[PDB]
Amino acid sequence: AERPTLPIPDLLTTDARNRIQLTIGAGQSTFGGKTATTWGYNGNLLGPAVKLQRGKAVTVDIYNQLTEETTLHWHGLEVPGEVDGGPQGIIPPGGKRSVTLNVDQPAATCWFHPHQHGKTGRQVAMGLAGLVVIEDDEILKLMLPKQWGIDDVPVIVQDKKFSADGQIDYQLDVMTAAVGWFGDTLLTNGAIYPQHAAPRGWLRLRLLNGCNARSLNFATSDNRPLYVIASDGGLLPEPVKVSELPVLMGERFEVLVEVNDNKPFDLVTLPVSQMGMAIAPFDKPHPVMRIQPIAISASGALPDTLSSLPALPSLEGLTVRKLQLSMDPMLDMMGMQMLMEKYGDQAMAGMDHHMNHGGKFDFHHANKINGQAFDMNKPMFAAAKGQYERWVISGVGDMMLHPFHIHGTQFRILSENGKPPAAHRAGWKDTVKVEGNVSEVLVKFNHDAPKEHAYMAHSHLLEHQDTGMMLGFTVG
Ligand SMILES: [Cu+2]
Numbered sequence: 001a002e003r004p005t006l007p008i009p010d011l012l013t014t015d016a017r018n019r020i021q022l023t024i025g026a027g028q029s030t031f032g033g034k035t036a037t038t039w040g041y042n043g044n045l046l047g048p049a050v051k052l053q054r055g056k057a058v059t060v061d062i063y064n065q066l067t068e069e070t071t072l073h074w075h076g077l078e079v080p081g082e083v084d085g086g087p088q089g090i091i092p093p094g095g096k097r098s099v100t101l102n103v104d105q106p107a108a109t110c111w112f113h114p115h116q117h118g119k120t121g122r123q124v125a126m127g128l129a130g131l132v133v134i135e136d137d138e139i140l141k142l143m144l145p146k147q148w149g150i151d152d153v154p155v156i157v158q159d160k161k162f163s164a165d166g167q168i169d170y171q172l173d174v175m176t177a178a179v180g181w182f183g184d185t186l187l188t189n190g191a192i193y194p195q196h197a198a199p200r201g202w203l204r205l206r207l208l209n210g211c212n213a214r215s216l217n218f219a220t221s222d223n224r225p226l227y228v229i230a231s232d233g234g235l236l237p238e239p240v241k242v243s244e245l246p247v248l249m250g251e252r253f254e255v256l257v258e259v260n261d262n263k264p265f266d267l268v269t270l271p272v273s274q275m276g277m278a279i280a281p282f283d284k285p286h287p288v289m290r291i292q293p294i295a296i297s298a299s300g301a302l303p304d305t306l307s308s309l310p311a312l313p314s315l316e317g318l319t320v321r322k323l324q325l326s327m328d329p330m331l332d333m334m335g336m337q338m339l340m341e342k343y344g345d346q347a348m349a350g351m352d353h354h355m356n357h358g359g360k361f362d363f364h365h366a367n368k369i370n371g372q373a374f375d376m377n378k379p380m381f382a383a384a385k386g387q388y389e390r391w392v393i394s395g396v397g398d399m400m401l402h403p404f405h406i407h408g409t410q411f412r413i414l415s416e417n418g419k420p421p422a423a424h425r426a427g428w429k430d431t432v433k434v435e436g437n438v439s440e441v442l443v444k445f446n447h448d449a450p451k452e453h454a455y456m457a458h459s460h461l462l463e464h465q466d467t468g469m470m471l472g473f474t475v476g
C-alpha cells in the first residue's frame with residue numbers, strides 16, 4: 001500500500017461576528033485498520049489550527065459535547081488567567097464557554113489542549129489537541145514558505161498504545177504515574193507514517209511534540225540539515241542549522257528543510273535517553289513522515305535575519321523564586337521496577353551507566369512542588385506583573401525528565417539543566433528541561449491571574465502533572 005497523505009488541520013479564522021466555533025466531542029478513528037473511539041475538536045481526532053493576528057481580538061465559543069468535564073488551555077498564548085483554561089476553567093458536559101482572546105505577542109506556533117484536573121493525560125491521549133498560528137506584521141515581510149498544507153505544514157507527533165480490541169489503552173496507574181504513558185505506535189497528525197508531497201525549495205515544518213510523556217529528537221534519514229527558525233514563543237534572531245533537534249513534550253519548533261527533485265527522504269525521530277522510551281520500535285530511528293518532492297518550484301525564502309532578540313537584562317535585584325520538584329521515592333522505585341519487570345533491560349537502554357496503607361500513600365498525590373501536590377484551592381505564590389523574575393527549578397533528588405512549563409509567559413532560559421541553553425533554545429520558550437539538575441528562567445507576566453483562575457506551572461509529562469507536579473500562582 002502507498003502511504004496515506006499527511007492530514008492537514010484546517011486553518012480557521014473568525015466569522016463576521018468575530019467568532020470561532022470549537023466543538024469538543026467523541027467519534028471514531030482507524031489505526032492499522034481497527035476502529036477506536038477518539039476525541040477531537042471539530043472532528044474525531046486532534047483539531048484545527050486557529051489563526052490569530054497580533055493586536056486583534058477574537059471570540060472563541062467552545063462547546064463541550066463530551067459527557068465529562070473538560071477545560072481548554074492555549075499553550076504558549078499570553079492571556080489573562082480568566083481565559084487561560086487551566087483546571088479551574090471548567091466547561092460542563094453539554095455546556096458552552098466563550099472566551100475573548102486579545103492577542104499581544106509575536107508570531108509563533110502555539111497549541112491548545114485540555115487541562116482537566118487530574119485527567120489531562122487521559123484527555124490528550126484520547127485525541128484532544130489543536131494548533132494556534134499567530135501572525136504579526138513582521139513575519140509576513142520575511143516571505144517564508146507560507147502555503148498552508150503545501151510548503152508550510154504542521155507536524156503533530158504523538159505516540160499511543162492500543163489494546164487488542166483496537167481501543168486506546170490509557171491507564172493512570174502506579175507504573176505510568178512513575179514513568180509516563182507511552183506506547184508503540186507513532187502518529188503524525190493522527191496518521192501512521194504518512195507522506196507529504198512538497199514543492200522543490202524550502203519546506204517549513206511546524207513541529208509539535210504532542211506526546212504525554214515521550215521526548216523526541218528529529219532528524220532526516222539522509223542527514224540533510226534542519227534550519228531552526230522559531231521556538232515555542234516565536235522566531236529566533238537568525239536561523240540555526242542543526243543535524244538533530246530534541247523536542248520535549250509540549251514544545252514547538254519551526255524548521256526549514258530543503259526539498260530536491262527525485263530524492264524522497266524521511267523525517268525521523270532518533271532514540272532518546274529517557275526511561276522506557278527506547279523500547280522497540282523506538283530503539284532505532286523511527287520514521288515520522290516521508291517527504292515526497294514535487295518538481296514544481298516552492299517560492300519561500302530562508303532569510304539571513306529573522307527578528308530582533310533583546311538582550312537579557314541585568315539579573316541583580318530580581319526576585320528569585322525556588323521551585324523544588326519531587327517524586328515519592330517509594331512509588332518511583334515501585335513504578336520503575338514494574339517497568340523493568342515488563343520490558344527488562346531495554347527499558348533503560350541509552351541511560352547513563354502490595355497492600356493498601358491508606359490515602360497517605362496514594363500515588364495520585366505522589367508528585368509535588370515545594371513539598372505540596374497540586375492544590376487547586378491554594379495558589380503557592382503571587383507573582384509580580386510586568387516585572388522580570390528569576391525562577392529556579394530543581395529536579396535534584398530524582399533522575400526523571402521534567403519539561404517544566406509556566407503559563408502566562410514566554411521566557412528566556414538562563415540555565416537549562418546546568419548549562420547555558422543551545423542557540424536554538426536561547427530565544428522565546430515556554431518549556432525548559434529539568435532532569436537531575438537545576439534550570440533557571442527569566443520570566444515576565446504581562447497579564448493578571450486571580451486565585452479563582454490562576455496560572456499553572458508544572459511538568460508537561462502529563463502523568464506527573466496529573467499526580468501532583470503542578471502549582472498555581474496568581475499575577476497582579
Ligand atoms: Cu500544554
Ligand SMILES: [Cu+2]
Pocket residue numbers: 073074075076405406407408
Ligand atoms: Cu500552557
Ligand SMILES: [Cu+2]
Pocket residue numbers: 073115405407456458
Ligand atoms: Cu499547563
Ligand SMILES: [O]
Pocket residue numbers: 073075115405460
Ligand atoms: O499545559
